[PDB]
Amino acid sequence: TALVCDNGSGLVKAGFAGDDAPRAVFPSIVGRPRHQGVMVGMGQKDSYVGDEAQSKRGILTLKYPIEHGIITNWDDMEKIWHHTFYNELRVAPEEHPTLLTEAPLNPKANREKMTQIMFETFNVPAMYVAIQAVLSLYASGRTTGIVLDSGDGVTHNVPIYEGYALPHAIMRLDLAGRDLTDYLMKILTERGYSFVTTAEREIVRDIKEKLCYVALDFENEMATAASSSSLEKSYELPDGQVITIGNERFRCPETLFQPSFIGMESAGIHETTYNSIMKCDIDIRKDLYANNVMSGGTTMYPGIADRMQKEITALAPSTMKIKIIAPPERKYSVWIGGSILASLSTFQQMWITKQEYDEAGPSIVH
Amino acid sequence: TTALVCDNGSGLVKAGFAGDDAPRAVFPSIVGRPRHQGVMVGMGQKDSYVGDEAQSKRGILTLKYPIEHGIITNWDDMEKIWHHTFYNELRVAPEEHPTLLTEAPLNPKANREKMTQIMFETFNVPAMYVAIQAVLSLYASGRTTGIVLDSGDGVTHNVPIYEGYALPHAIMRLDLAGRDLTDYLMKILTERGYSFVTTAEREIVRDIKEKLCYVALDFENEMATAASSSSLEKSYELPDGQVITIGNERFRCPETLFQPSFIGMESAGIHETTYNSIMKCDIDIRKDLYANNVMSGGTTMYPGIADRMQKEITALAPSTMKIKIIAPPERKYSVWIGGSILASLSTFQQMWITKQEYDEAGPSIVHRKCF
Amino acid sequence: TALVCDNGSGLVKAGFAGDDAPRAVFPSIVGRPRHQGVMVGMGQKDSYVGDEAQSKRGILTLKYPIEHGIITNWDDMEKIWHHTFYNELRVAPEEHPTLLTEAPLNPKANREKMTQIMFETFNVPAMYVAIQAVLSLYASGRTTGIVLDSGDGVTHNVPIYEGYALPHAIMRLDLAGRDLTDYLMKILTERGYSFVTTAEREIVRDIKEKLCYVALDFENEMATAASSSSLEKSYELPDGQVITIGNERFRCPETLFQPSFIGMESAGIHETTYNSIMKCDIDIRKDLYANNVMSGGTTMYPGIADRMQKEITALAPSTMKIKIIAPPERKYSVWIGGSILASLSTFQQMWITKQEYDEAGPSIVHRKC
Amino acid sequence: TALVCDNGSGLVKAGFAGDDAPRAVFPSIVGRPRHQGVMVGMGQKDSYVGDEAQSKRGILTLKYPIEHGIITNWDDMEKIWHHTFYNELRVAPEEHPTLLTEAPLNPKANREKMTQIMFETFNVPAMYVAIQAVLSLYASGRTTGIVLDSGDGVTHNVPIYEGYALPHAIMRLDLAGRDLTDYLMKILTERGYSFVTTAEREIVRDIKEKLCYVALDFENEMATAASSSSLEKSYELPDGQVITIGNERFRCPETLFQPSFIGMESAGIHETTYNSIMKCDIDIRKDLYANNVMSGGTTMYPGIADRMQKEITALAPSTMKIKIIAPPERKYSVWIGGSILASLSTFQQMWITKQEYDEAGPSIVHRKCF
């Protein structure tokens, strides 16, 4: 049984092949103590991984091994992979052909190091690395293209025509969920609330998921928010305090369409989708326009499809049909597509085997 | 062999062996010397008296406490107390037993340096260690989380511990304890016409405070009832046959803990100090600190202090939070009980400060090893 | 003329435009008695503001209406402003327009309440609110650079390029002189000295200013302090008692570079400045490195410029040249820059007039500023 | 106008507000005959109060109605007040409000009974109770300093800073002139002279007031007394006998600085003054050291000011400057301040009027009077 391990910047998605939902969806954080231990009872583990770090985040400094789709701390990454295999999956790595998903345009050394560590430290019989965006289209049962994948670290829109991922027409935007969390932390100081440490970042992140939404008309929404109190909501802090946010609800997600809110000179998600499509062939443009796929966890805000539909229609020939696909399972679409691909019997011929890694160069995966 | 535990304090001194349930010897920490002229020669008149010996003959002596506000003041009387504690109360040889000592937080570094020097050069102990009173209090409670309120006789301190990781930046040490409450009761006892100004009569007033004083839930309402009728009045008999009756002084002396301005102190009460300490910690641990409120000390034995603390903290804390105050019936020796548990543990048996390390690094090794 | 009032968290620096030094420099404290008065033949005021509180601090409870740059007690702030205009400056607020300062990344309701009080309680003809960090760069006489403004309240970094304050690279750290004073109070107990009251806090503040300094190397300095007693210095308390500190001198200011000493996860001032520079565009980073303007009172420790120079140099690329600008008069730079700004004729078009507030409410300040 | 009464343990000082010295100062004693009256035809008034008792003290017994600053006999006290108001002053209490004094730490029943007596027995229109130490500072023309107010029954120190009193730093001691008189009575038996009767107690008091001084260096002045007889001073008894006292001259006043002479566990006046100063705020100790107001009859020994200055200097740091204030009129400082306070225009709004006593009874004295 293959293991489809889709590891991202924010969340780690792992589970057996042939299922429909990852078994272990836990944060990708490694925390270490920052205080002085007084009690001698219990060893007081020097490093917590996953939900253990989240529960004890008060006395820990949370760290992210992956920075924007790029692995930074290899030692922390090895700990997380060890935690997923033993503590979460409870299955040995040497008895399963694991499948991994890496971000598009990954450095060759990054992929070789991942393959080398997996084959040696975990002794996996075989492994294959697939593109995150392609699997999202696979889970949707399409081969059209323009798959907008926005997560915690990066935001990509990879076009895949007839199973062929067009490499030149791949646009990348650095703005993602983590930057939206930082933006909300900065503009939450207007009402007096102050969040600074890494533990507060998780608290603010939960606020953004529960309350923040997307407004199709920013100017009209701003006027109504400043003229009425209907938009204001409440959220109880872990220590019992009650906070109230008004126009901050529909302002934080607005950074996706207007990256200038966080000092970014790039284009929005709607403009970077339009630019990517026209870079493809003329015949493909009609195919991409009718079948546009929204994936990732960042695109889970209410009304995101309606705003995106209105935006793309503005930069449209006004005669083609613009349709956006937003499946309800878009948060786990990358893993669901990977699970389907692994379950395919025809796909079982494609696996980078161990002796091909050793008897040949480590670049055999490429 | 067995590791000794000595919980020397400003008031009562607790000593014994690790692994037991209660201290073997509990005697006051006073040293008395004669102040009159001897007339009867050959009466086996001892020079100085310590412990209960001084208390029994306090009428002709001047009782002097060698420890004030947690800090050891006289290093000659203290050596007398330890010598009496080891050779008379415990009847053991210090040369063969390691000793686990105990010190209050936020104390001078020379305090534990002189403790280390005294125990290694005079009593010649094999090993020793210094522990924090509030940490040992949580050891006896059987939990590794919460905030401890340790009010004794010289110092009241709060130490918040979460999952075994203490927070040194949220430790609040207050210098109001039972000694100040006893002195305050003396001033308000003169209000009714009773005068007790001596070292011996200080003990008499202290016994009055323990037997009669209590804490009122509503101070202003309790004032009204005391003035309205005489239902709030109890009598006490002096050691010479006199009878004294007190009224509202019963619940006025313990009120200085919650209203320190009575004795001219600008600091806040114990309820405010605990609340400030909790909110100086992380936001993700405040809920676990609110549920676990540990009280361990002689001062906290008033009939109603748990209810008063619960009411005061409840108003300060938000309505959603649930406040629970832990008041074990045997909290007067919680520090020693926890110290007995800690010394018996096998892990602590490797963290002692052996004699060889001291002899090659001086008395400064106590800072790099102890907490 | 116009009025400039730099309302800090520890000191109040008011005066007139066109001057080189502030006129009134007094602590921002409102003290009230805590004992019971018995002398009938004596004037007993209810509250004392300014230097009067310091003189009679023995029997008073000193209170700061401003904490962490945010005004908490508005009635006390109203008293302080009334004292500043009448008892200290002896002028009429209804005659001179006022220029007030607010720290960056402050609550929106702070300036709304501030402009309401000024236009109603004091009835100023016009007013304006300016960022302290921008005024710090004006005093130094430059347009491009990064400012490290550390005082008694908050410590913030604002990279200003050609007069533009970039809003996406504004850092803010709540560690400053007040937190250093508390740290020195806590670590002074290791030698037997105990200072607990608010009056004792003022005494400790004087000790830190006169004795504490910054060591280029922390570890070798600690070895020197433990090796011999060549670093110990004395200080006479107001009661005539003598205290001595040998290693608390360079340990208290080190909290700025190592905020973990007071249990703070945030990085030091040298790391915060580096992070602010990298958050800017790559085409202006060289200009920001050259112009490192240090302003405020907390940056007055000896050797802090040399220590900051070597800390940023290690973090910065080797090719780049690092220059830490630390003018000797960097304690009143915020007021000096604001004094210059109000004196300029171009700035006179940005005043918020009385009629403008009467037709748009307190919210006019956000649009104008 | 209003009256000012300074009824103490030993002396009664009464007069009118606004004056400089009390109009009538007489001992606070009541005497009753103990012998038998062979000639019953004479007047032979049952009880004698004041200087009348002192003159006829040969056949009388002297009883003090006030002991240690606390009124003990409440019937002789009323007789003293009646004599003070109707004979010494010859005024009408029903028309003149009175201002009384009390020790700092006294039972609350003392003032309540005084308030009840004044408003019922004497029908005064208004009344007030003031602390003796505060009134001492009024007569000194100051508003900051610690007052060492000694007397016949109680010695107390009250620190005041800028008109604000610190009640927690108040120190009270029950060693005063009466105890010193008894100690001199005991040590006078060393040379053979015996004084046992209350009448002889007054004679001993006169001897103490005349020949008694505070030695600067107790050990050295003792050495001089043994070496030579230059310290020998004589005194003549009322009968006609003469006595000689030597080292007893400077040993009786030494009990103030060494209370162990009479078997007392309290500290000396210099130690008590230092302890009270150190209990105050650190910032105000500099002003307290400079201002040390010494008031009271007991503080009139020759050399007590010099001795106190030397003793406090040793305890205080070298940087500190110690000044002992001792005006020559310190024997009436309490009354002088009382006259000044009553004459003040602001004080006229805080008298306890009859109507307030009518509705609240003899309990409003705590709320109004400090």
Ligand SMILES: Nc1ncnc2c1ncn2[C@@H]1O[C@H](COP(=O)(O)OP(=O)(O)OP(=O)(O)O)[C@@H](O)[C@H]1O
């Ligand atoms: N309902 C929601 N609304 C808004 N944001 C959400 C929601 N659920 C999750 N998020 C945010 O989306 C991110 C997680 O999405 P996702 O599972 O795609 O991340 P990932 O796999 O770590 O990303 P990537 O592969 O791009 O690095 C987090 O930043 C999380 O806070």
Ligand SMILES: Nc1ncnc2c1ncn2[C@@H]1O[C@H](COP(=O)(O)OP(=O)(O)O)[C@@H](O)[C@H]1O
């Ligand atoms: N039942 C009681 N009620 C009130 N106070 C008490 C009671 N029992 C003891 N105390 C006070 O506790 C103080 C010291 O208690 P303890 O904690 O044993 O001393 P230490 O703090 O030195 O260990 C004493 O001064 C005494 O006044």
Ligand SMILES: Nc1ncnc2c1ncn2[C@@H]1O[C@H](COP(=O)(O)OP(=O)(O)O)[C@@H](O)[C@H]1O
């Ligand atoms: N010579 C000095 N050395 C160290 N710190 C100083 C010195 N002078 C002033 N400070 C600190 O500067 C702080 C206030 O500076 P300032 O910026 O003028 O006040 P504010 O922050 O209110 O504007 C004080 O808290 C003080 O500790």
Ligand SMILES: Nc1ncnc2c1ncn2[C@@H]1O[C@H](COP(=O)(O)OP(=O)(O)O)[C@@H](O)[C@H]1O
């Ligand atoms: N010259 C003196 N030398 C020594 N003692 C004196 C002298 N004059 C007065 N005294 C003492 O002062 C005491 C009373 O003083 P005073 O304070 O006026 O009375 P009261 O204590 O009633 O107010 C007397 O007991 C007397 O012994």
Ligand SMILES: [Mg+2]
């Ligand atoms: Mg992903």
Ligand SMILES: [Mg+2]
């Ligand atoms: Mg204890």
Ligand SMILES: [Mg+2]
């Ligand atoms: Mg400032």
Ligand SMILES: [Mg+2]
């Ligand atoms: Mg008197």
